[PDB]
PDB file of N, CA and C and ligand atoms in Angstrom:
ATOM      1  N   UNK A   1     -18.034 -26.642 -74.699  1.00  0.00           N
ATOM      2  CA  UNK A   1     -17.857 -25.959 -73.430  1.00  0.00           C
ATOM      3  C   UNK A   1     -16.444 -25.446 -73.240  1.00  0.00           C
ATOM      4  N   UNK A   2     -16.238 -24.169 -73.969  1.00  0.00           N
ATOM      5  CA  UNK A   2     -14.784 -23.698 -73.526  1.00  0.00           C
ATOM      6  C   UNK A   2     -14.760 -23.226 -72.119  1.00  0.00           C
ATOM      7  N   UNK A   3     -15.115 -23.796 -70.999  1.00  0.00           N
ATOM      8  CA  UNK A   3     -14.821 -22.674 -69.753  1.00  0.00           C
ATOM      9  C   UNK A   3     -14.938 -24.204 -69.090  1.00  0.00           C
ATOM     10  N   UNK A   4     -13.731 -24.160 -68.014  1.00  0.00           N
ATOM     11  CA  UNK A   4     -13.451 -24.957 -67.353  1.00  0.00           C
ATOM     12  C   UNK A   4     -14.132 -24.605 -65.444  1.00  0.00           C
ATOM     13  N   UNK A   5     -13.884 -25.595 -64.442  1.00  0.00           N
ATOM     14  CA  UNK A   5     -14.261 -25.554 -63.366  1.00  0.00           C
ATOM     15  C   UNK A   5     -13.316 -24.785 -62.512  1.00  0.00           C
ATOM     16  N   UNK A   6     -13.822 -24.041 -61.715  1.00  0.00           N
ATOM     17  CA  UNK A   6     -12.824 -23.175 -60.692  1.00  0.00           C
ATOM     18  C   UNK A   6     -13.798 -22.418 -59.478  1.00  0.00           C
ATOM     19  N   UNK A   7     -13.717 -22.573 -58.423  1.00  0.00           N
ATOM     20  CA  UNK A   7     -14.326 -21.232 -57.978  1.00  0.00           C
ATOM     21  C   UNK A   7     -13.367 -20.942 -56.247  1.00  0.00           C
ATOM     22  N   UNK A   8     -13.789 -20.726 -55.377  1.00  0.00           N
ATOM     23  CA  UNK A   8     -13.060 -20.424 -54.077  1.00  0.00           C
ATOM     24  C   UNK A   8     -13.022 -21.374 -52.956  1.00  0.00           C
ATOM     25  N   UNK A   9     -12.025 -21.782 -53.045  1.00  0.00           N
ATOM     26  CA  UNK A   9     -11.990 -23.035 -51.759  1.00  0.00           C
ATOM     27  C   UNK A   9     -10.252 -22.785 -51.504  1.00  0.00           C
ATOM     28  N   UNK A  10     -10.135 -23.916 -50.451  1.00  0.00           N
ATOM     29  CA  UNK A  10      -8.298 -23.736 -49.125  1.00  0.00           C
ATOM     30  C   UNK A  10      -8.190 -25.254 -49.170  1.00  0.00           C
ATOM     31  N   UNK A  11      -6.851 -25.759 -48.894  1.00  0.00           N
ATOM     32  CA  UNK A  11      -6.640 -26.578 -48.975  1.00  0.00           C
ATOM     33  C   UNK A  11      -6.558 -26.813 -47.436  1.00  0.00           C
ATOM     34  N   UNK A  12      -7.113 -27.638 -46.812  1.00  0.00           N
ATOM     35  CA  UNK A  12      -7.356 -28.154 -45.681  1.00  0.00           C
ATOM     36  C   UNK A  12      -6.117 -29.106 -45.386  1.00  0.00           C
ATOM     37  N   UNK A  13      -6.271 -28.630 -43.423  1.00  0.00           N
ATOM     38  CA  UNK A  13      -4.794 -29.168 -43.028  1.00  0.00           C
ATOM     39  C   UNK A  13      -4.594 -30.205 -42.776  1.00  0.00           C
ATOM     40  N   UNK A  14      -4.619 -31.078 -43.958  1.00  0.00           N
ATOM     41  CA  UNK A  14      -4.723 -32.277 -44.240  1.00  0.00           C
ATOM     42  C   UNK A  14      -2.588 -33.068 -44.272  1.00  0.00           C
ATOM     43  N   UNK A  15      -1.787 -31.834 -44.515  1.00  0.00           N
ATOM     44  CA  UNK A  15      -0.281 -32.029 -45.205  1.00  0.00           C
ATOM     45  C   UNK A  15       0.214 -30.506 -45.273  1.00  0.00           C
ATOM     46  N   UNK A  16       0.992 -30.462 -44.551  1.00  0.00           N
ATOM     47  CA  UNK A  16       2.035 -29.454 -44.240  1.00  0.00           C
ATOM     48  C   UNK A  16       3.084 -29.227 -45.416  1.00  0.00           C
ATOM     49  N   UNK A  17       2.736 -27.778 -46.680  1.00  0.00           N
ATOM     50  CA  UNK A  17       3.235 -27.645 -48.022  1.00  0.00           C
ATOM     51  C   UNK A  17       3.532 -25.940 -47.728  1.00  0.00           C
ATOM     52  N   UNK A  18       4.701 -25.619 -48.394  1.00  0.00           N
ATOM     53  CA  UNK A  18       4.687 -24.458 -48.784  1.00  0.00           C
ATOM     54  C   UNK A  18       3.219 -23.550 -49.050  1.00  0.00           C
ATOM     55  N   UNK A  19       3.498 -22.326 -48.714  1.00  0.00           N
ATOM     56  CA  UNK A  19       2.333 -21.470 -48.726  1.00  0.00           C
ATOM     57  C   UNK A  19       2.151 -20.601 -49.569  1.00  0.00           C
ATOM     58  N   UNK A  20       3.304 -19.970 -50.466  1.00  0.00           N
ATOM     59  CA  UNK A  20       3.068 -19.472 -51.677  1.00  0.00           C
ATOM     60  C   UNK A  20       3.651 -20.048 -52.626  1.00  0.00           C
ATOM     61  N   UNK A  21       4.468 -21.300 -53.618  1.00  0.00           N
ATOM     62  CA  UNK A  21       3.774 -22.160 -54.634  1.00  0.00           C
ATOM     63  C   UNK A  21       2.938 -23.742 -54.175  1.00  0.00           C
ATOM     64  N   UNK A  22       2.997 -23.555 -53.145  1.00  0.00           N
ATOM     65  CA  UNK A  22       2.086 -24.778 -52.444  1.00  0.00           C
ATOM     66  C   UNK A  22       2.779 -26.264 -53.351  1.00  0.00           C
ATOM     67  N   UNK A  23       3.896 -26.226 -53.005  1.00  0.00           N
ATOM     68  CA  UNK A  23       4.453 -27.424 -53.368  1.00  0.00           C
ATOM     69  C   UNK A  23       5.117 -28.430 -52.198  1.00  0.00           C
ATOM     70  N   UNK A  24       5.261 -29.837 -52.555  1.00  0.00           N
ATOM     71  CA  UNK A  24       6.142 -30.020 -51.571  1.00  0.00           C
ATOM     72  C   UNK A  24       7.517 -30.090 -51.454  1.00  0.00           C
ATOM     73  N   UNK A  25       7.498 -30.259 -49.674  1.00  0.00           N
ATOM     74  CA  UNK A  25       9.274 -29.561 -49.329  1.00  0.00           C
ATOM     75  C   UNK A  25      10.494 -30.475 -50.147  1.00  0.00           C
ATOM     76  N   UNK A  26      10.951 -29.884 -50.418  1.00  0.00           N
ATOM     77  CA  UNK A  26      12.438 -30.161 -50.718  1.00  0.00           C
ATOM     78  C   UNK A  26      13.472 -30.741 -50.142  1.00  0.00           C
ATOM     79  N   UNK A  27      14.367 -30.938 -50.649  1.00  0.00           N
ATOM     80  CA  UNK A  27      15.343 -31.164 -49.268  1.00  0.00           C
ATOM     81  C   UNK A  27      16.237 -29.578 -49.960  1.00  0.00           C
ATOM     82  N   UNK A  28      16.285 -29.237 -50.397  1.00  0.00           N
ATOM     83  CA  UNK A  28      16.859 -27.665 -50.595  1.00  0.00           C
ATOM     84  C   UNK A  28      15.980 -26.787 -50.082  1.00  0.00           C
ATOM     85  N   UNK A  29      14.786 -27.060 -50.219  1.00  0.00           N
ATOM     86  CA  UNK A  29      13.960 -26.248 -50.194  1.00  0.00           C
ATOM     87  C   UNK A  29      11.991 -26.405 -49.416  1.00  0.00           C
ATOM     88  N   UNK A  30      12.953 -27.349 -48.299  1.00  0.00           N
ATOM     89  CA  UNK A  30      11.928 -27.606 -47.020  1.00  0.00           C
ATOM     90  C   UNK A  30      11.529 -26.742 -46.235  1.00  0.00           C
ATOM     91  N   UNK A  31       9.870 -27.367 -46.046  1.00  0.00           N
ATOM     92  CA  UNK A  31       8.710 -26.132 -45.335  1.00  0.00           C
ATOM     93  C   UNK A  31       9.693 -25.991 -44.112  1.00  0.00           C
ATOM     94  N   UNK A  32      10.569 -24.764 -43.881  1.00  0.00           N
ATOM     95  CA  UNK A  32      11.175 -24.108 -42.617  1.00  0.00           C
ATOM     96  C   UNK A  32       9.907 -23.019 -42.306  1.00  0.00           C
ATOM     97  N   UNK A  33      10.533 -22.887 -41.177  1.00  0.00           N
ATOM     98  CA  UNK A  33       9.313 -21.698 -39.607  1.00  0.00           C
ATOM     99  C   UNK A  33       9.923 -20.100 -39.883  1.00  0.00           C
ATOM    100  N   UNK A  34       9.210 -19.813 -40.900  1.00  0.00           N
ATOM    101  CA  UNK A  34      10.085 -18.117 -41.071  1.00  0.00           C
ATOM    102  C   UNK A  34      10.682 -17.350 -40.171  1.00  0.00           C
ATOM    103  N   UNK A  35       9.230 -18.102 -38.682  1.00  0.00           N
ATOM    104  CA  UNK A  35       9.250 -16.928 -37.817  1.00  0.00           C
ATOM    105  C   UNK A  35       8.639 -18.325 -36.704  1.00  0.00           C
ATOM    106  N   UNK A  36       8.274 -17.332 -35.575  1.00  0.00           N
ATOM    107  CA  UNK A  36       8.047 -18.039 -34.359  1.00  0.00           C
ATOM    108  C   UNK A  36       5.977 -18.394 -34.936  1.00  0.00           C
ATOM    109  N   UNK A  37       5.574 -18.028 -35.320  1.00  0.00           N
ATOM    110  CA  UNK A  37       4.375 -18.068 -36.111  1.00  0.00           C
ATOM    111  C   UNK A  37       3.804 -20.135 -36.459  1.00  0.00           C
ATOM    112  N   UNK A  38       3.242 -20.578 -35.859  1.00  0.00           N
ATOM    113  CA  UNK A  38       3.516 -21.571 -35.681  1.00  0.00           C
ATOM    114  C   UNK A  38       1.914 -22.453 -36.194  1.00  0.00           C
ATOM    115  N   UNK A  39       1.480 -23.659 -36.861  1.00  0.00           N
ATOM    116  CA  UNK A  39      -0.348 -24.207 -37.118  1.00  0.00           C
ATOM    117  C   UNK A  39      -0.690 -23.629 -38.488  1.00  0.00           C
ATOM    118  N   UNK A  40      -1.052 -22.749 -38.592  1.00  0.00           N
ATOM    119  CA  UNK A  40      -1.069 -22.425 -39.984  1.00  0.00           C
ATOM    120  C   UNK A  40      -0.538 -22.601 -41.127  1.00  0.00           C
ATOM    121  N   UNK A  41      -0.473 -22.462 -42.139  1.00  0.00           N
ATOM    122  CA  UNK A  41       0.185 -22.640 -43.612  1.00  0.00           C
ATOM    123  C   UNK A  41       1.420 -21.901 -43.172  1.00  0.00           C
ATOM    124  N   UNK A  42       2.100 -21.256 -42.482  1.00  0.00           N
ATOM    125  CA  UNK A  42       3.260 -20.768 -42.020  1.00  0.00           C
ATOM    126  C   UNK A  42       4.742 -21.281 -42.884  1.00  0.00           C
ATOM    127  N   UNK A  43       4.679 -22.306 -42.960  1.00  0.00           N
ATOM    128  CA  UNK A  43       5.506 -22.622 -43.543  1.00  0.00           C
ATOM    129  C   UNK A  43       6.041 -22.770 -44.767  1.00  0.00           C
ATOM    130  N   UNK A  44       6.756 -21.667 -45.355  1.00  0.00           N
ATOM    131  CA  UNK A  44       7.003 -21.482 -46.847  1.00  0.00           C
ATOM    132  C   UNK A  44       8.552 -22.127 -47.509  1.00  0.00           C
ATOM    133  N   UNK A  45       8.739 -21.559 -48.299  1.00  0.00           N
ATOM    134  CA  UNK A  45      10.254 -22.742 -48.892  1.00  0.00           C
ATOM    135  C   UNK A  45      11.437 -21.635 -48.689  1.00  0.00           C
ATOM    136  N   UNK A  46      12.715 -21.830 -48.404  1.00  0.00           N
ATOM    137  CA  UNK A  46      13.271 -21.224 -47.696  1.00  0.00           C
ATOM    138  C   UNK A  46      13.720 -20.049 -49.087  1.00  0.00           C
ATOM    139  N   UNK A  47      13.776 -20.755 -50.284  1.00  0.00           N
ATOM    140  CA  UNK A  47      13.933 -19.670 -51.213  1.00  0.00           C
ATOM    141  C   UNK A  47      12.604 -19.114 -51.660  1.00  0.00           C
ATOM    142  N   UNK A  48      11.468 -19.475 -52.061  1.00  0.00           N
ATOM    143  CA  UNK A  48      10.099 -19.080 -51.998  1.00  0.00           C
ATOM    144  C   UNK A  48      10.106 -18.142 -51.142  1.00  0.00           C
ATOM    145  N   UNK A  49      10.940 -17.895 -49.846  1.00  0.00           N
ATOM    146  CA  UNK A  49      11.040 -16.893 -48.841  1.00  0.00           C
ATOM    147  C   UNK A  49      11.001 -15.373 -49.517  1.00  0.00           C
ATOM    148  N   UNK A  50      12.041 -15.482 -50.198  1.00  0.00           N
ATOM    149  CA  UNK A  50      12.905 -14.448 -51.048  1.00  0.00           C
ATOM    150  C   UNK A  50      11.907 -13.635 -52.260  1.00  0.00           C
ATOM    151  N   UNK A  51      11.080 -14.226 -52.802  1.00  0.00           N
ATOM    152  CA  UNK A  51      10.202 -13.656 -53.675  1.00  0.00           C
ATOM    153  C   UNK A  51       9.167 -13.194 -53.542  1.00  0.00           C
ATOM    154  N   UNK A  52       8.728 -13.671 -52.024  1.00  0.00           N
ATOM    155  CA  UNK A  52       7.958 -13.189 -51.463  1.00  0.00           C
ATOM    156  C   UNK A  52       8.381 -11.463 -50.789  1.00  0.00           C
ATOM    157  N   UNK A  53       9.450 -11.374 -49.744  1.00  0.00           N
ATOM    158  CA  UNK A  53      10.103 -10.778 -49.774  1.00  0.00           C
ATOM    159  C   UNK A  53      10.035  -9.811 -50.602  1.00  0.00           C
ATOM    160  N   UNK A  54      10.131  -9.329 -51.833  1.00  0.00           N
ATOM    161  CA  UNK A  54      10.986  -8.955 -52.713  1.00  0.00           C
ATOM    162  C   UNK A  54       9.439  -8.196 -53.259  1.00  0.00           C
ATOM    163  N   UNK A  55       8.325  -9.015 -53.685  1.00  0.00           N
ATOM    164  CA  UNK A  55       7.155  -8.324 -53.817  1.00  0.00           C
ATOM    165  C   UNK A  55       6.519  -7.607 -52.781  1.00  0.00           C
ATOM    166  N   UNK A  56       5.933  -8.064 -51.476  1.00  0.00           N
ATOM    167  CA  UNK A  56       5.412  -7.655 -50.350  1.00  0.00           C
ATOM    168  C   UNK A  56       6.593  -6.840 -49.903  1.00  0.00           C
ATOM    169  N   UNK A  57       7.194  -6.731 -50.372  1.00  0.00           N
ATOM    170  CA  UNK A  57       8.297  -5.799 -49.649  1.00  0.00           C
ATOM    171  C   UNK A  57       8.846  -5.823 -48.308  1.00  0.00           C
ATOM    172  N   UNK A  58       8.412  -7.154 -47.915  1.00  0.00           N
ATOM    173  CA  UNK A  58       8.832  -7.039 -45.788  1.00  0.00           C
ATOM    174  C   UNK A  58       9.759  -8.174 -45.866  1.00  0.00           C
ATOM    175  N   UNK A  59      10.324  -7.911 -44.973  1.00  0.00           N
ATOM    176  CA  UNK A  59      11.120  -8.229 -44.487  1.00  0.00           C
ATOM    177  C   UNK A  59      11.185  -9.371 -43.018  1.00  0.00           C
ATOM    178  N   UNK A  60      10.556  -8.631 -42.520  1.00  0.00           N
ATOM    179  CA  UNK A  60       9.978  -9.326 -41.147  1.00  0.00           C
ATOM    180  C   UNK A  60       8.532  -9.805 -41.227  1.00  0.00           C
ATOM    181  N   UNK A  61       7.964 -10.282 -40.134  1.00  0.00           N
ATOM    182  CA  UNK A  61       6.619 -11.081 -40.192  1.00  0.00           C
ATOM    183  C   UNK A  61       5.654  -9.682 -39.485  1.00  0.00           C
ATOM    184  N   UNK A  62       4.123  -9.885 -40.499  1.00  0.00           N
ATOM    185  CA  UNK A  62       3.265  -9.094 -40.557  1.00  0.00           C
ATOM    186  C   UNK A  62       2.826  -8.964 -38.759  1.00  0.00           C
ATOM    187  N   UNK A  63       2.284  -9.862 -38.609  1.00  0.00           N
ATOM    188  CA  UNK A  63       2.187 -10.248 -36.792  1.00  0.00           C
ATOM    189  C   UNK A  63       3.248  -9.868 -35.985  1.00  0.00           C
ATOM    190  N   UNK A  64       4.234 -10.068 -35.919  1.00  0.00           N
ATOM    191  CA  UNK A  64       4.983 -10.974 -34.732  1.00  0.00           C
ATOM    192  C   UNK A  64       5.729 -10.107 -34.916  1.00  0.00           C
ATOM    193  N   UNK A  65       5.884  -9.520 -36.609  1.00  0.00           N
ATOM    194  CA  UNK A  65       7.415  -8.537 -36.718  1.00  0.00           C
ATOM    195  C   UNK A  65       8.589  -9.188 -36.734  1.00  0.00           C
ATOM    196  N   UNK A  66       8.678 -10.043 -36.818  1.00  0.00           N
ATOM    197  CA  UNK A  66      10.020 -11.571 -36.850  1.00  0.00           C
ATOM    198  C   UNK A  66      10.982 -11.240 -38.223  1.00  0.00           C
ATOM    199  N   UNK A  67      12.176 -10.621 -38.045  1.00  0.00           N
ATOM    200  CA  UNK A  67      12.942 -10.793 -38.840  1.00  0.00           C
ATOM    201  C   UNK A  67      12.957 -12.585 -39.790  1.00  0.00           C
ATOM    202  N   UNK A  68      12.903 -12.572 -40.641  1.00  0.00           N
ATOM    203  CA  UNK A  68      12.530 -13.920 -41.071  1.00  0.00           C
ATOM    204  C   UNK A  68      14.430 -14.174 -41.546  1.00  0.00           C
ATOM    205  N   UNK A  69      14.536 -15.462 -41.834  1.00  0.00           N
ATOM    206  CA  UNK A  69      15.802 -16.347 -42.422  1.00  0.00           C
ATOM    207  C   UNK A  69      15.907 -16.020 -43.443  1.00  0.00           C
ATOM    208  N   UNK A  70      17.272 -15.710 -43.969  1.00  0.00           N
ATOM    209  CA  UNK A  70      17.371 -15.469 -45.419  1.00  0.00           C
ATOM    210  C   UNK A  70      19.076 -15.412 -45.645  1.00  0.00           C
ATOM    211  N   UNK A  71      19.854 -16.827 -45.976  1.00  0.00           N
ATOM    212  CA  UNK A  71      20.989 -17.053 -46.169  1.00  0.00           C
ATOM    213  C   UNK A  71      22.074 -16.024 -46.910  1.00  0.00           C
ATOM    214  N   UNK A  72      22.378 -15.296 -46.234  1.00  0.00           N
ATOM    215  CA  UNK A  72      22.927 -13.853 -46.643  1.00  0.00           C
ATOM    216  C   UNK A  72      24.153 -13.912 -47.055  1.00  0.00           C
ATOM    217  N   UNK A  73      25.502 -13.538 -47.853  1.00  0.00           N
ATOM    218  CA  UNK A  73      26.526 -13.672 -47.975  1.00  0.00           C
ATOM    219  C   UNK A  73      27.076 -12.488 -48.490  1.00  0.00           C
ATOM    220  N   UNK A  74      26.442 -11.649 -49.222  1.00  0.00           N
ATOM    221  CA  UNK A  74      27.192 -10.631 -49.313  1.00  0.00           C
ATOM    222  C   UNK A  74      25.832  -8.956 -49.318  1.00  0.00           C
ATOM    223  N   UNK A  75      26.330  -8.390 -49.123  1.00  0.00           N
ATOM    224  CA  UNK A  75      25.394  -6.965 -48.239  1.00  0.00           C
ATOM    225  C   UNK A  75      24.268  -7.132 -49.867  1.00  0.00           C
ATOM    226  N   UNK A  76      25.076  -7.022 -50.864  1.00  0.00           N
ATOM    227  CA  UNK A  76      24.404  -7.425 -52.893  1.00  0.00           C
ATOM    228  C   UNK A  76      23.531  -5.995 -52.710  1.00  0.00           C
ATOM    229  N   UNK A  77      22.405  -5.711 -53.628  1.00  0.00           N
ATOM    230  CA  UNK A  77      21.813  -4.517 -53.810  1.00  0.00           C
ATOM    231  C   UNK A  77      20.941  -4.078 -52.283  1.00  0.00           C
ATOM    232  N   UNK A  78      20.534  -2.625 -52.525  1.00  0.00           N
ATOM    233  CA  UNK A  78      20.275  -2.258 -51.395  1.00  0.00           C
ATOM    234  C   UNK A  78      19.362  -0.426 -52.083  1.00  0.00           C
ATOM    235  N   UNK A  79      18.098  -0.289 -51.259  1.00  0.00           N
ATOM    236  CA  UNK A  79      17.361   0.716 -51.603  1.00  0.00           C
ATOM    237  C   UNK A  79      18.305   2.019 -51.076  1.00  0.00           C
ATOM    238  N   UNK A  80      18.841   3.157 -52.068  1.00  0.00           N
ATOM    239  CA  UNK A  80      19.134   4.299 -51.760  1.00  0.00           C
ATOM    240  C   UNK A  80      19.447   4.782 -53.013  1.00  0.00           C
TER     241      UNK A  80
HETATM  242 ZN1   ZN B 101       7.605 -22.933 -52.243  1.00  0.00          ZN
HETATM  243 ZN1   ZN B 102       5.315 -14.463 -37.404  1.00  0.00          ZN
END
Protein backbone atom coordinates (compact mmCIF):
# COMPACT_ATOMS: atom_id res chain seq x y z
CA UNK A 1 0.00 0.00 0.00
CA UNK A 2 2.04 2.99 -1.21
CA UNK A 3 -0.65 5.73 -0.48
CA UNK A 4 -1.00 6.93 2.88
CA UNK A 5 -4.21 8.53 4.90
CA UNK A 6 -5.24 12.20 4.36
CA UNK A 7 -8.40 13.82 3.45
CA UNK A 8 -10.20 17.37 4.76
CA UNK A 9 -10.67 18.17 8.29
CA UNK A 10 -9.67 21.75 10.97
CA UNK A 11 -8.23 21.51 13.93
CA UNK A 12 -10.79 22.27 16.52
CA UNK A 13 -10.59 24.99 19.20
CA UNK A 14 -9.35 22.80 21.39
CA UNK A 15 -5.49 25.15 21.90
CA UNK A 16 -4.75 28.46 20.68
CA UNK A 17 -1.54 27.82 17.80
CA UNK A 18 -0.35 29.84 15.08
CA UNK A 19 -2.46 29.83 11.92
CA UNK A 20 -0.17 29.50 9.11
CA UNK A 21 2.66 26.86 10.35
CA UNK A 22 0.26 25.83 13.12
CA UNK A 23 2.92 25.49 15.62
CA UNK A 24 3.25 26.38 19.07
CA UNK A 25 3.97 29.94 20.44
CA UNK A 26 7.28 30.82 21.18
CA UNK A 27 8.54 33.04 23.42
CA UNK A 28 10.13 34.91 20.21
CA UNK A 29 7.58 34.00 18.41
CA UNK A 30 4.12 33.96 20.43
CA UNK A 31 0.46 33.65 19.05
CA UNK A 32 0.19 37.83 19.10
CA UNK A 33 -3.49 39.63 17.83
CA UNK A 34 -2.36 40.98 14.29
CA UNK A 35 -5.30 42.99 14.45
CA UNK A 36 -8.38 43.76 16.59
CA UNK A 37 -9.87 40.36 14.92
CA UNK A 38 -10.37 38.37 17.91
CA UNK A 39 -11.91 33.78 18.59
CA UNK A 40 -10.72 32.46 15.63
CA UNK A 41 -7.33 30.98 14.57
CA UNK A 42 -6.38 34.79 14.43
CA UNK A 43 -3.50 34.40 15.96
CA UNK A 44 -0.32 33.92 13.93
CA UNK A 45 3.58 34.14 14.98
CA UNK A 46 4.80 37.51 14.96
CA UNK A 47 7.47 36.57 12.27
CA UNK A 48 5.13 33.95 10.44
CA UNK A 49 3.43 37.51 10.14
CA UNK A 50 5.99 38.56 7.56
CA UNK A 51 5.69 35.65 5.05
CA UNK A 52 2.51 35.78 5.02
CA UNK A 53 2.65 39.33 4.21
CA UNK A 54 5.06 39.01 1.59
CA UNK A 55 2.94 36.23 -0.41
CA UNK A 56 -0.75 37.53 0.05
CA UNK A 57 0.66 40.68 -0.51
CA UNK A 58 -1.40 42.74 2.36
CA UNK A 59 -0.47 44.40 4.53
CA UNK A 60 -3.42 45.14 6.63
CA UNK A 61 -6.31 42.73 7.69
CA UNK A 62 -8.74 41.35 4.95
CA UNK A 63 -11.93 42.37 7.29
CA UNK A 64 -11.20 45.03 9.52
CA UNK A 65 -8.37 46.56 7.19
CA UNK A 66 -6.02 46.66 10.42
CA UNK A 67 -2.64 47.70 9.65
CA UNK A 68 -1.07 44.57 11.29
CA UNK A 69 2.51 44.66 13.65
CA UNK A 70 5.57 44.28 12.01
CA UNK A 71 8.90 45.35 13.98
CA UNK A 72 10.26 47.85 11.51
CA UNK A 73 13.76 49.42 11.70
CA UNK A 74 14.79 50.52 8.67
CA UNK A 75 12.32 51.81 5.49
CA UNK A 76 14.79 48.16 3.64
CA UNK A 77 13.17 47.38 0.06
CA UNK A 78 10.16 48.95 -1.25
CA UNK A 79 7.82 48.43 -4.66
CA UNK A 80 8.80 51.20 -7.38
ZN1 LIG B 1 3.93 30.35 13.03
ZN1 LIG C 1 -8.74 41.94 11.48
Amino acid sequence: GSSGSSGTSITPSSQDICRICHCEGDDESPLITPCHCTGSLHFVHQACLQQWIKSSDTRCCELCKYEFIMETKLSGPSSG
